[PDB]
Design a protein around this nucleic acid. Sequence first.
RNA 1: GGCUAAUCCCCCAUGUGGACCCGCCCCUUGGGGUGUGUCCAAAGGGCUUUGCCCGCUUCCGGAUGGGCCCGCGUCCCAUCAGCUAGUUGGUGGGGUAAUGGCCCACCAAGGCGACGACGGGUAGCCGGUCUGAGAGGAUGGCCGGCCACAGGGGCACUGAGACACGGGCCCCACUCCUACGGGAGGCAGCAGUUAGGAAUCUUCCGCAAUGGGCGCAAGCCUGACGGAGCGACGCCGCUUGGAGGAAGAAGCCCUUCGGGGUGUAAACUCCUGAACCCGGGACGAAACCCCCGACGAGGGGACUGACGGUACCGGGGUAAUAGCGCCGGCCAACUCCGUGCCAGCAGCCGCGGUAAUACGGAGGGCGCGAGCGUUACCCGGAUUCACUGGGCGUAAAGGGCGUGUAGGCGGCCUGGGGCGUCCCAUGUGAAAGACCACGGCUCAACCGUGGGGGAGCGUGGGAUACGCUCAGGCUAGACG
Lengths: 99, 99, 138, 124, 208, 83
Amino acid sequence: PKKVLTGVVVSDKMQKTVTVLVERQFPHPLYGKVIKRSKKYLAHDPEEKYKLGDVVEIIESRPISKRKRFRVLRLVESGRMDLVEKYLIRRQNYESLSK
Amino acid sequence: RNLSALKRHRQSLKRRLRNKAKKSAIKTLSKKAIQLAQEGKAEEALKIMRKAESLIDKAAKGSTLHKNAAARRKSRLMRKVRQLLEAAGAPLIGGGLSA
Amino acid sequence: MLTDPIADMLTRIRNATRVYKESTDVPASRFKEEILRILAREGFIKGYERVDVDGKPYLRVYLKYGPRRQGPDPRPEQVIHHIRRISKPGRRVYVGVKEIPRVRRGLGIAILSTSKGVLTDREARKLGVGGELICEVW
Amino acid sequence: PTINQLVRKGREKVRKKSKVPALKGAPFRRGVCTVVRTVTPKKPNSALRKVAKVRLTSGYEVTAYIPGEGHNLQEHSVVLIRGGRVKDLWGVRYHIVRGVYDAAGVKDRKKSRSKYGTKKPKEA
Amino acid sequence: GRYIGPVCRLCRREGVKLYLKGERCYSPKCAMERRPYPPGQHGQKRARRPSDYAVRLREKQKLRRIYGISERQFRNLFEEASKKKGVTGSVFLGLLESRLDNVVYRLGFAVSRRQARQLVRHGHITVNGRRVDLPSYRVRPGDEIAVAEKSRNLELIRQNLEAMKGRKVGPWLSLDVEGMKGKFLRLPDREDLALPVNEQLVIEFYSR
Amino acid sequence: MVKIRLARFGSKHNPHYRIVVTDARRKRDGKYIEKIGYYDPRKTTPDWLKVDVERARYWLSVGAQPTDTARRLLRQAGVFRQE
RNA sequence: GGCUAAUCCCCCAUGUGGACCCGCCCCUUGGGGUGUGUCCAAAGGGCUUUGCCCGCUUCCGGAUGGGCCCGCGUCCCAUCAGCUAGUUGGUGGGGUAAUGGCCCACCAAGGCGACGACGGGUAGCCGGUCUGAGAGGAUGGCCGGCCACAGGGGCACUGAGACACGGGCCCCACUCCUACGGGAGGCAGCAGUUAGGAAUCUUCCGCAAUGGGCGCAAGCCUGACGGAGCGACGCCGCUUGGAGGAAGAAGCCCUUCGGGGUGUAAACUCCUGAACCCGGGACGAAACCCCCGACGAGGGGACUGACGGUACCGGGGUAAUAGCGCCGGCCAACUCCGUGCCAGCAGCCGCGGUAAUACGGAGGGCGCGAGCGUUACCCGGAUUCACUGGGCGUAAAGGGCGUGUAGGCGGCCUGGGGCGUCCCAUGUGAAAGACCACGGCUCAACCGUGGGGGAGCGUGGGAUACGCUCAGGCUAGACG
Ligand SMILES: [Mg+2]
Ligand SMILES: [Mg+2]
Ligand SMILES: [Mg+2]
Ligand SMILES: [Mg+2]
Ligand SMILES: [Mg+2]
Ligand SMILES: [Mg+2]
Ligand SMILES: [Mg+2]
Ligand SMILES: [Mg+2]
Ligand SMILES: [Mg+2]
Ligand SMILES: [Mg+2]
Ligand SMILES: [Mg+2]
Ligand SMILES: [Mg+2]
Ligand SMILES: [Mg+2]
Ligand SMILES: [Mg+2]
Ligand SMILES: [Mg+2]
Ligand SMILES: [Mg+2]
Ligand SMILES: [Mg+2]
Ligand SMILES: [Mg+2]
Ligand SMILES: [Mg+2]
Ligand SMILES: [Mg+2]
Ligand SMILES: [Mg+2]
Ligand SMILES: [Mg+2]
Ligand SMILES: [Mg+2]
Ligand SMILES: [Mg+2]
Ligand SMILES: [Mg+2]
Ligand SMILES: [Mg+2]
Ligand SMILES: [Mg+2]
Ligand SMILES: [Mg+2]
Ligand SMILES: [Mg+2]
Ligand SMILES: [Mg+2]
Ligand SMILES: [Mg+2]
Ligand SMILES: [Mg+2]
Ligand SMILES: [Mg+2]
Ligand SMILES: [Mg+2]
Ligand SMILES: [Mg+2]
Ligand SMILES: [Mg+2]
Ligand SMILES: [Mg+2]
Ligand SMILES: [Mg+2]
Ligand SMILES: [Mg+2]
Ligand SMILES: [Mg+2]
Ligand SMILES: [Mg+2]
Ligand SMILES: [Mg+2]
Ligand SMILES: [Mg+2]
Ligand SMILES: [Mg+2]
Ligand SMILES: [Mg+2]
Ligand SMILES: [Mg+2]
Ligand SMILES: [Mg+2]
Ligand SMILES: [Mg+2]
Ligand SMILES: [Mg+2]
Ligand SMILES: [Mg+2]
Ligand SMILES: [Mg+2]
Ligand SMILES: [Mg+2]
Ligand SMILES: [Mg+2]
Ligand SMILES: [Mg+2]
Ligand SMILES: [Mg+2]
Ligand SMILES: [Mg+2]
Ligand SMILES: [Mg+2]
Ligand SMILES: [Mg+2]
Ligand SMILES: [Mg+2]
Ligand SMILES: [Mg+2]
Ligand SMILES: [Mg+2]
Ligand SMILES: [Mg+2]
Ligand SMILES: [Mg+2]
Ligand SMILES: [Mg+2]
Ligand SMILES: [Mg+2]
Ligand SMILES: [Mg+2]
Ligand SMILES: [Mg+2]
Ligand SMILES: [Mg+2]
Ligand SMILES: [Mg+2]
Ligand SMILES: [Mg+2]
Ligand SMILES: [Mg+2]
Ligand SMILES: [Mg+2]
Ligand SMILES: [Mg+2]
Ligand SMILES: [Mg+2]
Ligand SMILES: [Mg+2]
Ligand SMILES: [Mg+2]
Ligand SMILES: [Mg+2]
Ligand SMILES: [Mg+2]
Ligand SMILES: [Mg+2]
Ligand SMILES: [Mg+2]
Ligand SMILES: [Mg+2]
Ligand SMILES: [Mg+2]
Ligand SMILES: [Mg+2]
Ligand SMILES: [Mg+2]
Ligand SMILES: [Mg+2]
Ligand SMILES: [Mg+2]
Ligand SMILES: [Mg+2]
Ligand SMILES: [Mg+2]
Ligand SMILES: [Mg+2]
Ligand SMILES: [Mg+2]
Ligand SMILES: [Mg+2]
Ligand SMILES: [Mg+2]
Ligand SMILES: [Mg+2]
Ligand SMILES: [Mg+2]
Ligand SMILES: [Mg+2]
Ligand SMILES: [Mg+2]
Ligand SMILES: [Mg+2]
Ligand SMILES: [Mg+2]
Ligand SMILES: [Mg+2]
Ligand SMILES: [Mg+2]
Ligand SMILES: [Mg+2]
Ligand SMILES: [Mg+2]
Ligand SMILES: [Mg+2]
Ligand SMILES: [Mg+2]
Ligand SMILES: [Mg+2]
Ligand SMILES: [Mg+2]
Ligand SMILES: [Mg+2]
Ligand SMILES: [Zn+2]
């Protein structure tokens, strides 16, 4: 199984590359609540087909750059900009919390 | 003292020189063909180019290259020769190239 | 707002019994109704019915007690001596089939809600499935 | 604390301090006396307690108790340090070990001789 | 080596008769006749009510002192028993009773458990035809515990054997006195055994 | 060169051998590919050797080579008899 | 500077086939086919030399070994809050077996971070181990797996493979040689020395076995290894005797002066017979080779020990080492004398300032026993970081109040999906350990053989109550 993941495209800034966001829920190892984490996958959009606020499948791949191991399989859904707004905000919140 | 795989070093030296030579030959020739291509003097470029190809496969025969090593060097060369042959190329010898 | 409705049922029941009521209204839903069906079957409540209260529908859980008693404290034994939630929102719990619990060495139960439906401990074992471990009762 | 709080924060495992820097963790260290002396015990008792300040091979210098009755030790003696405190004296965290190195055993002592480092008496 | 010294004093300290002494632990000299109180200055003085600990201790003690076995051997054998599938007290007892020295005793070749340990030790004893000297050898049911024909002529051996004429052997064994051959037919039970010991007190000792 | 050989599993003065398939270059006593047999020099049991031929045959098909001792055991069990 | 052989090097030839550029087809990341053009091979040696053995060349597959990449897991500090220039992507290129800012130029301006980036501290990781009723805590010595390093730092060459512990270049520290020009080293390999330390072995034996290198072989090499030596370091077995023997010697102990204790203990009686002496005396070892058959199969068939004259069998044979802690409570075991806030004891409580069962001896007692105590460290106890399993009115603990971001959490009805969750199948979960059974050394320790278990993760199939989710209702919450 080359691994597939599903995520939301939260950054298109780069050339031929999209920042993809993939959530994982998993039961916590002691306390046993289900905790829901995530990471940004850096994923290879050759034709600049994919656009921000999409939702994609991402597939484990032959390496593209340092940091790109994954390319973009399909379009599961287009149009979740809410999700993007979440991420944009989490990072927006960073601007507090310092000095 | 005087452990006698001392001899091994002794040999490894000679081998060194032999590889180095063979490989220099290769380079100087390759570049020769390339310049010749830039110039678009087509048939000349080709005859060098074939000497180069051959000398490469020869280098391959032994421990200078082997492998895909040579094949890489060859594909690179030929591509570049042919590409370089458009400024009105009309590839005269066409010895090395599939028509 | 109400928050874990199933806890709130089991609780309405816990209180009701300790002050020895004949019955109580827990506001209703098919999942509670299923939890109850199992209670009745298992002998903890008398039974339950569907009622309406100022139009909005509930469930009368009719209650079981022991017989009256000797000396000071005539209050009869409880039938549900113990009732408690296990999985809760905010910590959910799931047993595999080989983890389903022996409650009070068997004299109590565990309501598991499974993909096969809501069943008791033994019921799930004999059925061979796992689930969300809802409460134990005894 | 809620559970979400235990996930967020989680219990604190608890450290401890070593009542003994003999450092090194070692079961004993060797060292060289400086002072051999006596001191006045803490409140609930009265007596004369024999003890040596020591330089230890650990780059470490400590008052250490001299158990038994008869003690030979003097200012250049080299002794082996034990660990364990004398509850009513100030700053003595370790014991000297009799029979080892310069500290000799308690002479005339017939009873608990593993401790006190005294060999066994003959008989005929 | 497990305790070698004035035994009849242990008859005394455990308060009860444990004959490691053979005859004379029969003949009314055991001192357990007319001097049953324990040894030392304070033996004849009053008994302070024994701690729960004390109780458990001296029961474990009685039970070990019987078999003359090292505490090491004993407790290792014991935890053996508590792993072993089934009821610990009994399992244990069966194990101790399964000791070769013990079987030699039970079979009546020697008058003391201890004497029999010497018998095993000095190779006067064979099992299924093969000599064994290790007192701790495990006799498995079906095994045949026999005297060694080389020593079958021995004073002491035939001695004890003749006194063993017409006497009956425990039911988990069989004996033939003309051939000294014997057989350990089964591992014995609590009931099969008369032991003046509450085993759960010993299990209880090892709880803590 | 993937070999077949005795590796040493007993105790001191009590050898027992796992006859095994392993790369030439492992330790004698370290990770093997497959254990096809066992050997008992002092022959303390009626089972002092075993093979699973059709396995030894496989590993021969792919050109494992045995020890001379190993070959001896193999032939004892006759991976070799063709008749 | 000169001579010269080769399975050393080179050049033509042949092209089974293969490499490469462009075309076509299939496949789908650089997989496979094909056509044309170009380029590519080789080594000889031994025999009984008419035939075989040993090799050599190009290719295709196999096997085993590895490179690289991805998900997930992997300690403490937030009194470390921001970090980032090859840094983040791209185009072309160099490099490699091979993807890749791995590198280089040029272009864009990105990438990461409270879900803890950066920083600092510690640290080889795992199989497992110890502890625990479990969850958990602690750890990673030996054996097995992986990594990493070989005086410190850099570097490449050779090669299938290395950036190479007993190979090479350079810098640095140190030791030694030095005609002062310059050279030589590299035990974290087996032993051994030296320092440091509380402390850790022999400069032994052997190539007989097993394994590895080269060899057609015979065979050489192997401080891998198999053994022996040392140290109660640990485990396991074993001995210091067995039975009889006083209403109980003497000495020593208390004494209420009647006696009580040591104690069946001893003496002595009798029996066995550790050590030790004597003879026999191993397995481990049947291959390689031998011959017959064809150097196969098969069949027979002989040589080959370090450990060792050891283990063991037979014979003969001597009553033949006991220690250590403790006895106020926790805690099993009490009395006399001595000392008199001294000397001392002491884990905690707390003993000793004249009757001390707590100090020191003695008699006696308990516990263990070739051990027994001590210190250190780990878990336990400790439900005292509380997932199992704690708390916050006065005991430590509600933030001075609010608004509200992330986040956590979410009423009733129906439907889709099936992500969580559950079930089945299968792969994986090496071996060793652990658990079960049987067995092998007289037993065990130790070993073998077999069985079983197992969280987790891959794949396929299935269920849909709850939890997600998407679509649609509702009005009991909320707002109006
Ligand atoms: Mg873009
Ligand atoms: Mg790229
Ligand atoms: Mg910022
Ligand atoms: Mg050579
Ligand atoms: Mg040039
Ligand atoms: Mg490339
Ligand atoms: Mg009903
Ligand atoms: Mg729970
Ligand atoms: Mg005072
Ligand atoms: Mg049991
Ligand atoms: Mg059972
Ligand atoms: Mg029976
Ligand atoms: Mg226990
Ligand atoms: Mg390898
Ligand atoms: Mg097998
Ligand atoms: Mg074959
Ligand atoms: Mg010359
Ligand atoms: Mg010359
Ligand atoms: Mg050549
Ligand atoms: Mg050619
Ligand atoms: Mg062709
Ligand atoms: Mg093609
Ligand atoms: Mg062609
Ligand atoms: Mg030629
Ligand atoms: Mg190949
Ligand atoms: Mg691979
Ligand atoms: Mg990771
Ligand atoms: Mg830079
Ligand atoms: Mg740059
Ligand atoms: Mg590139
Ligand atoms: Mg994250
Ligand atoms: Mg480190
Ligand atoms: Mg560590
Ligand atoms: Mg355990
Ligand atoms: Mg606990
Ligand atoms: Mg705990
Ligand atoms: Mg761990
Ligand atoms: Mg760890
Ligand atoms: Mg390690
Ligand atoms: Mg290791
Ligand atoms: Mg690996
Ligand atoms: Mg280094
Ligand atoms: Mg060094
Ligand atoms: Mg270096
Ligand atoms: Mg090579
Ligand atoms: Mg190379
Ligand atoms: Mg390379
Ligand atoms: Mg290296
Ligand atoms: Mg070296
Ligand atoms: Mg040099
Ligand atoms: Mg020293
Ligand atoms: Mg050694
Ligand atoms: Mg050899
Ligand atoms: Mg060999
Ligand atoms: Mg020959
Ligand atoms: Mg040599
Ligand atoms: Mg060795
Ligand atoms: Mg010692
Ligand atoms: Mg022992
Ligand atoms: Mg006697
Ligand atoms: Mg007397
Ligand atoms: Mg005799
Ligand atoms: Mg043989
Ligand atoms: Mg032999
Ligand atoms: Mg032979
Ligand atoms: Mg012939
Ligand atoms: Mg043959
Ligand atoms: Mg033969
Ligand atoms: Mg040989
Ligand atoms: Mg010999
Ligand atoms: Mg003998
Ligand atoms: Mg004899
Ligand atoms: Mg004697
Ligand atoms: Mg007491
Ligand atoms: Mg004391
Ligand atoms: Mg006085
Ligand atoms: Mg006094
Ligand atoms: Mg007083
Ligand atoms: Mg006293
Ligand atoms: Mg005391
Ligand atoms: Mg005292
Ligand atoms: Mg005494
Ligand atoms: Mg010890
Ligand atoms: Mg602790
Ligand atoms: Mg809790
Ligand atoms: Mg848990
Ligand atoms: Mg509390
Ligand atoms: Mg107050
Ligand atoms: Mg308070
Ligand atoms: Mg307040
Ligand atoms: Mg306050
Ligand atoms: Mg609010
Ligand atoms: Mg919110
Ligand atoms: Mg709900
Ligand atoms: Mg699913
Ligand atoms: Mg499975
Ligand atoms: Mg296993
Ligand atoms: Mg093992
Ligand atoms: Mg084992
Ligand atoms: Mg056995
Ligand atoms: Mg599945
Ligand atoms: Mg459905
Ligand atoms: Mg549904
Ligand atoms: Mg369905
Ligand atoms: Mg939600
Ligand atoms: Mg709605
Ligand atoms: Mg309305
Ligand atoms: Zn008696």
